[PDB]
Amino acid sequence: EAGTAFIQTQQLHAAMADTFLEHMCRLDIDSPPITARNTGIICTIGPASRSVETLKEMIKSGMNVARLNFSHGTHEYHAETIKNVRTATESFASDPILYRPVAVALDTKGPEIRTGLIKGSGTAEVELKKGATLKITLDNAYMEKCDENILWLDYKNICKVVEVGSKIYVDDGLISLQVKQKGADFLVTEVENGGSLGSKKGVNLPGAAVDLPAVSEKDIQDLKFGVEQDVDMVFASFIRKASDVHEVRKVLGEKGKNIKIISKIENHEGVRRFDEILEASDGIMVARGDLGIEIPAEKVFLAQKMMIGRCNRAGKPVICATQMLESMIKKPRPTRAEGSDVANAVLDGADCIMLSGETAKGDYPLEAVRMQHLIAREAEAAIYHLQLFEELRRLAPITSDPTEATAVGAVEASFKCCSGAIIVLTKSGRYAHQVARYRPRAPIIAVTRNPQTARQAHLYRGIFPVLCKDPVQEAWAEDVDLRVNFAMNVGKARGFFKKGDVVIVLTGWRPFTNTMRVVPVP
Amino acid sequence: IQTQQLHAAMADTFLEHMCRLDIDSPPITARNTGIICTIGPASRSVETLKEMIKSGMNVARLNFSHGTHEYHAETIKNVRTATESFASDPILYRPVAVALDTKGPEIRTGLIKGSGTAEVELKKGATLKITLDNAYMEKCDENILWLDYKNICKVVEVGSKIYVDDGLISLQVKQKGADFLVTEVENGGSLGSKKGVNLPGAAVDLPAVSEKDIQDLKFGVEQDVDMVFASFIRKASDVHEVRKVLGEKGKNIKIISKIENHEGVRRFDEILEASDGIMVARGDLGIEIPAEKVFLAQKMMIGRCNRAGKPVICATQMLESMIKKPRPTRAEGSDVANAVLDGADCIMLSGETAKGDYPLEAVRMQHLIAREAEAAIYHLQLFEELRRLAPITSDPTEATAVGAVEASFKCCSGAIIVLTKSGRYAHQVARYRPRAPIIAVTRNPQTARQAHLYRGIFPVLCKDPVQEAWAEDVDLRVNFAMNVGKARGFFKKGDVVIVLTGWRPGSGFTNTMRVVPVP
Numbered sequence A: 001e002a003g004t005a006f007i008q009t010q011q012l013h014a015a016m017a018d019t020f021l022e023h024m025c026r027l028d029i030d031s032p033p034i035t036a037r038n039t040g041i042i043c044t045i046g047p048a049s050r051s052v053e054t055l056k057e058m059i060k061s062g063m064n065v066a067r068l069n070f071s072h073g074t075h076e077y078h079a080e081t082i083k084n085v086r087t088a089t090e091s092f093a094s095d096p097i098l099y100r101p102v103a104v105a106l107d108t109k110g111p112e113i114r115t116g117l118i119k120g121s122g123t124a125e126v127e128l129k130k131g132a133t134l135k136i137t138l139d140n141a142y143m144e145k146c147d148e149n150i151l152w153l154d155y156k157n158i159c160k161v162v163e164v165g166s167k168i169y170v171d172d173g174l175i176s177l178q179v180k181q182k183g184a185d186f187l188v189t190e191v192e193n194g195g196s197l198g199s200k201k202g203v204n205l206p207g208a209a210v211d212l213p214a215v216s217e218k219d220i221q222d223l224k225f226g227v228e229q230d231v232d233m234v235f236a237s238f239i240r241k242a243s244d245v246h247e248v249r250k251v252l253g254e255k256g257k258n259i260k261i262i263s264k265i266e267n268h269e270g271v272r273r274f275d276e277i278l279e280a281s282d283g284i285m286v287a288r289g290d291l292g293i294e295i296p297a298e299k300v301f302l303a304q305k306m307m308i309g310r311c312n313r314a315g316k317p318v319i320c321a322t323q324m325l326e327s328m329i330k331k332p333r334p335t336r337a338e339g340s341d342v343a344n345a346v347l348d349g350a351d352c353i354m355l356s357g358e359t360a361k362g363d364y365p366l367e368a369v370r371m372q373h374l375i376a377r378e379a380e381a382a383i384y385h386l387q388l389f390e391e392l393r394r395l396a397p398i399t400s401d402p403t404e405a406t407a408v409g410a411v412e413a414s415f416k417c418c419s420g421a422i423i424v425l426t427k428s429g430r431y432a433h434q435v436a437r438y439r440p441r442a443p444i445i446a447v448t449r450n451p452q453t454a455r456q457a458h459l460y461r462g463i464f465p466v467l468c469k470d471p472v473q474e475a476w477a478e479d480v481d482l483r484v485n486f487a488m489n490v491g492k493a494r495g496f497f498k499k500g501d502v503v504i505v506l507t508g509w510r511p512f513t514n515t516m517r518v519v520p521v522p
Numbered sequence B: 001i002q003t004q005q006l007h008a009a010m011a012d013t014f015l016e017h018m019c020r021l022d023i024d025s026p027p028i029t030a031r032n033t034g035i036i037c038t039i040g041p042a043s044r045s046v047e048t049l050k051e052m053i054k055s056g057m058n059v060a061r062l063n064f065s066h067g068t069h070e071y072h073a074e075t076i077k078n079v080r081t082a083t084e085s086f087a088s089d090p091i092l093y094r095p096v097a098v099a100l101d102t103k104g105p106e107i108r109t110g111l112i113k114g115s116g117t118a119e120v121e122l123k124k125g126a127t128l129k130i131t132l133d134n135a136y137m138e139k140c141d142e143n144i145l146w147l148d149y150k151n152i153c154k155v156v157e158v159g160s161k162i163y164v165d166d167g168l169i170s171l172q173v174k175q176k177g178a179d180f181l182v183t184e185v186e187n188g189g190s191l192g193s194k195k196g197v198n199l200p201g202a203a204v205d206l207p208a209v210s211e212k213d214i215q216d217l218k219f220g221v222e223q224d225v226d227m228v229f230a231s232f233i234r235k236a237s238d239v240h241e242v243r244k245v246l247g248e249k250g251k252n253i254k255i256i257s258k259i260e261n262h263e264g265v266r267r268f269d270e271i272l273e274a275s276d277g278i279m280v281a282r283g284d285l286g287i288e289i290p291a292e293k294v295f296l297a298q299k300m301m302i303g304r305c306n307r308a309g310k311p312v313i314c315a316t317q318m319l320e321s322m323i324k325k326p327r328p329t330r331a332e333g334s335d336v337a338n339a340v341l342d343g344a345d346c347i348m349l350s351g352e353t354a355k356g357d358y359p360l361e362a363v364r365m366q367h368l369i370a371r372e373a374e375a376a377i378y379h380l381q382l383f384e385e386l387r388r389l390a391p392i393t394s395d396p397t398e399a400t401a402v403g404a405v406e407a408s409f410k411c412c413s414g415a416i417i418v419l420t421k422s423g424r425y426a427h428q429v430a431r432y433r434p435r436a437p438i439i440a441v442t443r444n445p446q447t448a449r450q451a452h453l454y455r456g457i458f459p460v461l462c463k464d465p466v467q468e469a470w471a472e473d474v475d476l477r478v479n480f481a482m483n484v485g486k487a488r489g490f491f492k493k494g495d496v497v498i499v500l501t502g503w504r505p506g507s508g509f510t511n512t513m514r515v516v517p518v519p
């Protein structure tokens, strides 16, 4: 009864524009997005978020992956976090229609450089003043006696790799020092950018060839623990070259062979060697915290868009990480730059976006999760699928693989009929991954009986995993019908589609494979 | 390998364009995006302003939400002293524009009662009474909060939401009175003095141009400001009111309409038609509408301004953490880059330069990021689409401008040099968004300052007397641009530059294009 003033939902007017410029001109704050949200949300768990009750609310707010940061905390601490994540996750298991799989990710310490404890209790801070002198020492007598005159750090070969004139950054790159004099086991520096220095802060040596192992002996101990704890994926810090990825993967052994290996790119060499790292990895994290200290801050966006582009081209998951909503550690709503950053990461093509301090330590963890969910959904509607889908195909090789032809045909069909979902029956995840790489607008409901598949599927844009708990039916067609009906019930319950809407169904392995059907929702 | 992201520039798809972006491909020296800096206590001294200019500031913004006319006159005096301290070298001198940002139909709280804590703690669930009784205008505390919107009770009802201080504090109306509201704290926090208030659910009925705004705009005319940033523009008739106040004496002052509420977004096209340009004023906008929708409004407005060839400014919290820290967050570095990639003519700093501890670092970071992002633009697609969407016309000047931009791509020119009295001839080149900088030579000092509103226009103020022969005077001005470009490192001998000049004496056509090896 309103009239022609009706506004197309999910930016459909912008979607039909013949140019990218006119696409932008048509973006409409009054065009509401669809219910489905395709970008995975990864949350770092810490003191602010590790209670079972908070974790339940984080799952409800949209958390898909729990990130454990092994730069901090002992093994018992992480074991208890994992236990709590699973308690919270399985509290929803009585209703398989609404249960959300939640993945567990181990983020390695890796070749970090860290300072010591400020003298006193270690909880105090000292003020470093611009122009003052600061001695860096390796003598362990000072490892708990750091102050404004002497700073201990844990990198035993630092004096070899730096030179007079080199810059040293401390604490998220906020403190900067210039090396004035070198010593046998010390450096004499002058404070350039001063500030308040606390304990055990990260140190970066841009332009220095740091020779710490990609995976140290202690890192291996963490990875072994991760296999014991049945984690789903490893985020490997400071990956510099393909062989670093192999050091992570091979040490997990046969028992850990299905754990996904995500290489974190956070230094100049990792960017330079990106193609060989990507080839060896299951996926990539754009780890912008260290990256933006190791290279100039003004170049990070180039590295981010390069890596997201190349991961999209290869069909491998890419995560955009660090400081996306940083002010929400202390404030209940984000800055305008932060809202923009999350939206542009999704428009760039990131499969997942991440929260670190915002959920690990901050005062508003749920609000931060909720805001990533809201922004992601708005940005997903704004993607110019007409160009993106055309380019993904053209940059995708002709192969004789029938399963790739099925996947692109399914996504093509999904665009042609504006389907409410692509339902995919998958054991390993592969069939759903193949669909996700062509970036449909519609959500991909991936039905699996494999619990690890259901958890790992969150690495891909658009894959909404659902874990089927029913016994296998002896008749294959009846087993397919059961799993398809499950996905139909999930989509109706979640508001992705309604009775009578059109969806695409990919029925997975048949004892041809992965038949496609385009059907109305029953 | 190749500089200036030229490998990415040759990609056949946008996806491959992204894949080819190279942190080891260094940009050109020239920086095309204008930098607007809000001046305040951190940046008001002549000594600091000199460094701001050296660091890349093109426009000084004066925020008339605060301060007296005496105060702002002294700020403007200091800006001009700093700017003219470089005039002894006319080849390196940079014009610096002055922008008056109006208070507009702002809502603000009063002063916190000065006898207690400087801020009061508002706690979730607590009662807070909003009063209009000016007895409390300097006695605000956790029990009673005065604000200056005297008609607020008419436009809210029970249940309305009220946001305070960058929308971080929120209240819900519970009852109403003759001159007061009873509210409950929804989101609490620490409340200081004179904080901005938003009523996103309400039709605020304050005048587009208040009596105070009239005084401020007339003062801007008297002070010879270059442009007005008009706050809270909701509709074309608001722009008309501003232009009427500026009147005949102020007729050449540029009006930039600030879009910061839902109505301004809805009525954007008619606002854009009447305005000289647009500010995406994201602070208020992100409170008036859901924070997750601001990027849609931003890219819509930048796109439509690019389509119209009118300047668009991206503003507010771009480098916000640099108020307190010497380096920005990763989201902030991304935000500045993406504003440039979106197509913003200018980017802006507010608290980062007005009040913060690191104003020079913030200016320098905007310069660095903008230049990197300018190289990463996919000009192949942008130029094709700008051409396809431009209005149809047989105008010789427009055809020469497009020809010059295409020529500049074909030879990777070091600059496009254009001569202009009032700015338009340079504006016409900028709207097709060449990669090369546009060195706009003018003898008009106001044109030189106003040109900063456009992406890529590097104004140079020629101070030589007019030569007797028209052709010699053209050559003098072109040679001035050539020497400026050489001195600034934009090009050197063996490079090629595009030169646009007028047809002949008495013609208004800029219809002559020369492709000049740099001598």
Ligand SMILES: O=C([O-])C(=O)[O-]
Residues within 6 Å of the ligand: A237, A264, A266, A286, A287, A288, A289, A290, A291, A321, A322
């Ligand atoms: O390690 C990280 O996540 C980073 O540095 O961004």
Ligand SMILES: O=C([O-])C(=O)[O-]
Residues within 6 Å of the ligand: B231, B258, B260, B280, B281, B282, B283, B284, B285, B315, B316
């Ligand atoms: O007024 C402004 O600049 C804003 O609100 O962003």
Ligand SMILES: [K+]
Residues within 6 Å of the ligand: A069, A070, A071, A107, A108, A109, A110, A237
């Ligand atoms: K880590």
Ligand SMILES: [K+]
Residues within 6 Å of the ligand: B063, B064, B065, B101, B102, B103, B104, B231
């Ligand atoms: K203002």
Ligand SMILES: [Mg+2]
Residues within 6 Å of the ligand: A237, A266, A287, A289, A290
């Ligand atoms: Mg890191």
Ligand SMILES: [Mg+2]
Residues within 6 Å of the ligand: B231, B260, B281, B283, B284
């Ligand atoms: Mg405002």
